[PDB]
């Protein structure tokens, strides 16, 4: 029975590394602590001091990370690649029933429902079937900008809702961006 | 090829052993100790802990005197001498009082568990015990192991208490820092259930891997008094590799 | 034997003191707790950089903490849950009748 | 009453907002 | 040698991990390279290098000579006739003097290069402000030389 | 145990080398090499505390 | 071109001119 000690000596040392990678989940360096995350992108003109693995907030609740920051010199703009944690930026059975009846009554009101196709039975299901396929939370004129975290913090993407009427799926691009603020031009334009 | 295969065999044998020490470890704890066990258990505390007490105060007094001495002089230049009490506390409590407490403990008592059992191997004072009939795994191992588990969290709190109270002595008695901003800097930032309690849960698994190796590597060693020192480093080497190797999983599970 | 009953009994003396040092002179849980403390809630827009177990103040006095900070996708806001105190925020019976008929003075306020 | 909701709230203001405070 | 690299790699990974996160809030991520260097070099690489050395080889000089005392290994040497103060002490003592400043430099070199690995590869810190933070504040003749003169009398 | 020895060596040697390599790389030279690095110039009046190897 | 000297630039302002412009 000389191989048994040997076998447990393998059984421990492969188990110790397995728990060692189990701590590599919640540590946050490798892997993401995100339950069914989904990617979105945005295009800026000034991403000064915005590292990868940054913070993405809605009003103060951190709901994402930042994965890669890319340029494209033919248009000289920035392009940010980020994923959001969604089970709390994504709706569910209550809110999907809530939003589908919201926009079909408000956006598709008598200004819009009584200016339309002949049969108002197929298009009424079109506004609801265009929403079940992974709608998130973010309206048509919500803007994304770069904050500065207090007074001497570090930069992070701030998603601000604009109220709006139509939302966007998992894969889109936010069309209302603005770059960071900088003390270089501002003191010159103040003095 | 030659030396390479040699080293390969070496590693294999080593891993094989390691496993063994696991098979020893269940056989010590999965039995109820008899009468007379507590009397040796007290004497092991008398041997391991009480003897180890005089060291960690001095190295406890030292590191606080240094850490509050040098960071402040760069920190005072902006606006902050009130966060002196936070940076001394939160690096001792969640970072060093687990780690640097063991490396002084693996130094003193991480050796004296091996050489006291490297004692009974060279003059066959192990073998005579079996021959008369006891089992040293019940007799000379289990009161040694149970003191080693207990006495280290009994010290690393003691360590960090003088560790913080040391840095107060440089601050208010020589740097003239405000006492109220010193302590209330800590009170707001150092919770109990997340730092001091989770500074203990680090120090338990830093005590088990440090003391179980130092028992086994003194038991299953050949009685040669040259290799009693090569077995001595493998206490210290495998402790310090694993007491540092398991800080990085324990830092990540608590926070991050 | 007799020295061993001393030299580890004196060890558990020192460890109890150095735990008392950390609990009752360093960390927050040194008694930080008011009487019958009730909870309320409120909604915000910017809760940027606000950890739970913060302070709450009325005139700079520590009357309570912040418990939980949740978002609600139903209306794109953040709703803070926090517990105040019950003694420093509720009037005593003497202070109650002091303002109750003064509220009756406010009620019957001429017109 | 106890358990109510305080009205009239306004959140934090930072460096990315003090520009909007002046101009 | 195999020990002090790992504990060398460790302490830099920690010291540049936690002070920065409080320091970044005002204006300073460029003084990260200074605080890692000037506390390792003038404070810890003398002290914490010895306590790992007194651990390993501070024991194996005793138990190797506690070897030759129990089996009268020592006494036989005198009886045949050598003097162990020339034979087994003096080559032991002269290695102990030499080998510790030969390690504590080795220690702090991976000590600083360890903290670079957390900074530029995970915290995204600027490389130029990292090193030129050190080169302005860490002179050679006052820090690294006087980090050796500590390590000799510690050896 | 030819097999045993050989196998042991293999893993060991591979690991060691790889490790040392990556380590020495994460410092000084070794890897530090751009691509298509040309050079432009400019002339100012007051650099003011600008450093070599800045961003 | 890869090798030119970018003509139009501007230097940086130190904090000392900021002081004098402040008053």
Numbering used by the authors:
A (entry chain K): 3 to 193
B (entry chain D): 1 to 256
C (entry chain J): 3 to 113
D (entry chain J), G (entry chain L): 171 to 193
E (entry chain A): 53 to 207
F (entry chain L): 3 to 57
Text taken from the publication that reported this structure:
The MlaFEDB complex is an ATP-binding cassette transporter to actively translocate the phospholipids between the inner membrane and the periplasmic protein MlaC4,5. Consistent with the previous reported low-resolution A. baumannii MlaFEDB map8 and our E. coli MlaFEDB map9 (EMD-30355), the MlaF (cytoplasmic nucleotide-binding domain, NBD), MlaE (transmembrane domain), MlaD (periplasmic phospholipid-binding domain), and MlaB (cytoplasmic auxiliary domain) subunits are assembled in a stoichiometry of 2:2:6:2.
To understand the mechanism of glycerophospholipid translocation coupled with the conformational change, distinct conformations of MlaFEDB were trapped using sodium ortho-vanadate. Vanadate acts as a potent inhibitor of ATPase by forming an ADP–vanadate complex that mimics the intermediate state formed during hydrolysis. Three individual conformations were classified and refined to 4.0, 3.6, and 4.0 Å, and were named Vtrans1, Vtrans2, and Vclose, respectively. The structure of Vclose shows the tight dimerization and close proximity of the NBD of MlaF subunits, caused by the trapping of ADP–vanadate or ATP at the ATP-binding sites comprising the Walker A, Walker B motifs, and the signature motif. The dimerization of the NBDs engages the coupled structural rearrangements of MlaE and MlaD, respectively.
